[PDB]
């Protein structure tokens, strides 16, 4: 339960071996199951020992110490497992205290492009492995897309502000090492329409399921019905959502038609009944006149006249009883007419307003995936859901910048230094860079390996900002073009004081139009100070970046005034506005599996580039250009924990190569 | 296995997707169908209203009071004559010939017209009823 829990935190199955363990321990997986169990226990126990105190290094000696028999036998086995878990970053990763002071005898040289979480993690690991590492950053700061505004006692994350659960999250360990305060968030997102009036509980809950149900319906339309290509072209989540909505409206309509058709059927059957009853009535009238003309022949009569009277009597009674039967049926049909007239099917699927609120929900989905739903693949947009961490999603109250900065201690970061060209050959690598302040100052860094952590938005740039010599192969460039890089933005609003409900962490705004469903759609409180963050998502983001600061802040204050009152919003003290797609060093926000791509493209973008032979007929060169980043991890994309996992992985790979 | 509250079938998807405007066309055609049905509902409602206006007054006024008669078994000469005539007119609705006689039952009528066969040439009377 404890060792197994260690397997769980480390994203490893506790009861079987992984492919990397089968590759580094091919002898154990290929032999007796008992020895496999032994290996698995040594793994899980070393991992538990590390995770129970991540602020100190775990040495092979301590591991064997703290092991018992029969698992303290095969000292080579234990040493092998420790080495594996250390090289791949499952133990002794992050900011820990070194028990074995490193060596000044450093082997190999690597240039890491980028000082984000990916690059910083890779650099720390490669330095601990004994290599010389120099990071080249264009910005004047570390962290990259982990950015924290800090003015006075105002602190607010402009990039990453969240940990998507701590159950199996690497960041958990880091949080114990950096002392970063994590705070929960409260479900409650009271929605408020344009008028400023809240949405009634009963329509809010309606619409919220209709949203969940429509998403499940897109999933069903993809996985059972195979509606993943249309017009020779791949389908998106938005196209499927609109197809589903259209079919629901069709259903309303058709049910409708069937109800009115039952009504017509019953009506016209009443028609025939009544019509027969009119005829029968005139006939009874005539027969009654005849009975009266016959029964006024005086009582002294032959038997033919008596027969006339009595036969007309019988015929009259028969026809009258038939009329009474038709008249009972008249009522048993009018009754069903007014039953059906009184249980009408539904008129609409979704009212205009209902639909605006559905648009708010769609905008939340667009915000978390940082892209218009028209850009996401219906079949592979949720391919990362099977690997979600367990627990409650949390926020960073002190500034999540705390992580990158702490990871940059003792590393050789060259800030304000922007790479222009990466040259890789069978003898080494040459990174050309410039000074962001004086472009004319050129720098040449020669290396045994390069680790590119450049954002996908930078790698997508055409005209290119970084040139690769020799040019990067097509199997990589097409993946770069296929994969999606999104955009989301924030508006940090600092204030005199709290004018909102301190008990609610999220409160929303429903937009007037579907096209404006992302325009300042959510306001968020998560700090000690009087700060509110206004979130911009979807197609709105890319447009809102071409609107002045003051105009955005004014729209924000306007909706806040409509919500809480013009007398309760003070004018903001400090205001910040994000523009991530315009950032020349980001070119957007985070990746999204786009229509036409898959998770195999992440893996392709994580594959190392191996140069060609300089001399013809020379032994195959070794790989030289390695890649890491959030756009390189399939099972955990577009996240900080994904970037750190990528950095650790690439550090392990590079060391496996150049250190053995 | 689609979701609950969602109605999605192969065919309908293909219909709404086959063309760039197929969706709006289908929906708005059904729209039109609905108007058509309700135009005809109002038509027939006015028709039936007129017919019911006709039937105002019911049949109460040419009804004849009901009378009960204890079913005897002695055929009076008058009753026999009435029965012959009621055969000639009603053929073999003997319930009805009991109704016209009023003092006979359906089995007594059925008997009668073996009882008297030869004597009232009832075969010939029936033949005549059938032309
Ligand atoms: C608004 C927003 C909020 C997010 N919030 C979260 C969150 O709460 N949690 C989460 O898990 N994920 C979040 N994500 C995604 C997550 O922040 C990122 O995946 C991740 O932090 C970036 O990883 P990285 O180090 O590979 O990229 P980067 O941090 O961008 O690393 C690349 C570095 O290279 C530098 N660089 C660029 N061009 C050059 C050049 N030519 N020469 C030299 N250096 C260069 C950049 O300045 C940057 O520092 C968010 C993303 C967005 C857009
Ligand atoms: C209240 C709340 C809680 C969680 C999420 C969420 N939930 C899931 C998620 O997933 C990452 C995606 C998965 C697919 N690739 C990247 C990301 C996010 C996320 C978190 C913070 C910001 C900011 N500032 C932006 C997005 C949003 C709001």
Swiss-Prot record, chain A:
Ways its activity is controlled: The N-terminal sequences of INSM1 and SNAI1 compete with histone H3 for the same binding site and thereby inhibit histone demethylation (in vitro).
Induction (free text): Down-regulated during neural differentiation in neuroblastoma cancer.
Cross-link for Glycyl lysine isopeptide (Lys-Gly) (interchain with G-Cter in ubiquitin), residue positions: 332
Coiled-coil regions listed in the entry: 257-343
Location in chain, cross-link Glycyl lysine isopeptide (Lys-Gly) (interchain with G-Cter in SUMO2): 271, 298
Enzyme class: oxidoreductase
One CC-aspect GO term: chromosome, telomeric region
Modified residues (N6-acetyllysine): 261-262, 265
Cofactor: FAD
GO terms, molecular function: chromatin binding; DNA-binding transcription factor binding; enzyme binding; FAD-dependent H3K4me/H3K4me3 demethylase activity; flavin adenine dinucleotide binding; histone demethylase activity; histone H3K4 demethylase activity; histone H3K9 demethylase activity
Catalyzed reactions: N(6),N(6)-dimethyl-L-lysyl(4)-[histone H3] + 2 A + 2 H2O = L-lysyl(4)-[histone H3] + 2 formaldehyde + 2 AH2
UniProt-annotated stretches for the region Demethylase activity: 129-660
Expression sites by tissue: Ubiquitously expressed.
Domain SWIRM intervals: 3-102
Keywords carried by this UniProt record: Acetylation, Chromatin regulator, Chromosome, Coiled coil, Cushing syndrome, Developmental protein, Disease variant, FAD, Flavoprotein, Isopeptide bond, Nucleus, Oxidoreductase, Phosphoprotein, Repressor, Transcription, Transcription regulation, Ubl conjugation
Binding site for FAD: 118, 137, 139, 145, 161-162, 630, 639-640
Subunit (UniProt): Component of a histone demethylase complex with RCOR1. Component of a RCOR/GFI/KDM1A/HDAC complex. Interacts directly with GFI1 and GFI1B. Interacts with INSM1 (via N-terminus). Component of a BHC histone deacetylase complex that contains HDAC1, HDAC2, HMG20B, KDM1A, RCOR1 and PHF21A. The BHC complex may also contain ZMYM2, ZNF217, ZMYM3, GSE1 and GTF2I. In the complex, RCOR1/CoREST strongly enhances the demethylase activity and protects it from the proteasome while PHF21A/BHC80 inhibits the demethylase activity. Interacts with the androgen receptor (AR).
This protein's name: Lysine-specific histone demethylase 1A
Section of the entire sequence shown: 172 to 831 of 852
From Swiss-Prot, chain B:
Swiss-Prot/TrEMBL domain comment: The SANT domains may bridge the nucleosomal substrates and the demethylase KDM1A.
Tissue: Ubiquitously expressed.
Domain of life: Eukaryota
Family to which the UniProt record says this protein belongs: Belongs to the CoREST family.
Origin species: Homo sapiens (Human)
Protein name in the entry: REST corepressor 1
Description of post-translational modifications: Phosphorylated by HSV-1 protein kinases in case of infection.
Ranges in coiled-coil conformation: 23-58
Residues of the SANT domain: 70-121
Residue span of region Interaction with KDM1A: 1-73
Function field: Essential component of the BHC complex, a corepressor complex that represses transcription of neuron-specific genes in non-neuronal cells. The BHC complex is recruited at RE1/NRSE sites by REST and acts by deacetylating and demethylating specific sites on histones, thereby acting as a chromatin modifier. In the BHC complex, it serves as a molecular beacon for the recruitment of molecular machinery, including MeCP2 and SUV39H1, that imposes silencing across a chromosomal interval.
Subunit structure: Interacts directly with GFI1 and GFI1B in a RCOR/GFI/KDM1A/HDAC complex. Interacts with INMS1. Component of a BHC histone deacetylase complex that contains HDAC1, HDAC2, HMG20B/BRAF35, KDM1A, RCOR1/CoREST and PHF21A/BHC80. The BHC complex may also contain ZMYM2, ZNF217, ZMYM3, GSE1 and GTF2I. Interacts with REST. Interacts with the SMARCE1/BAF57, suggesting that the BHC complex may recruit the ATP-dependent chromatin-remodeling SWI-SNF complex. Interacts with SOX2. (Microbial infection) Interacts with herpes virus HSV-1 ICP0 protein; the interaction leads to the disruption of the BHC complex, thereby preventing the BHC complex from repressing transcription of viral genes.
Subcellular location, record wording: Nucleus
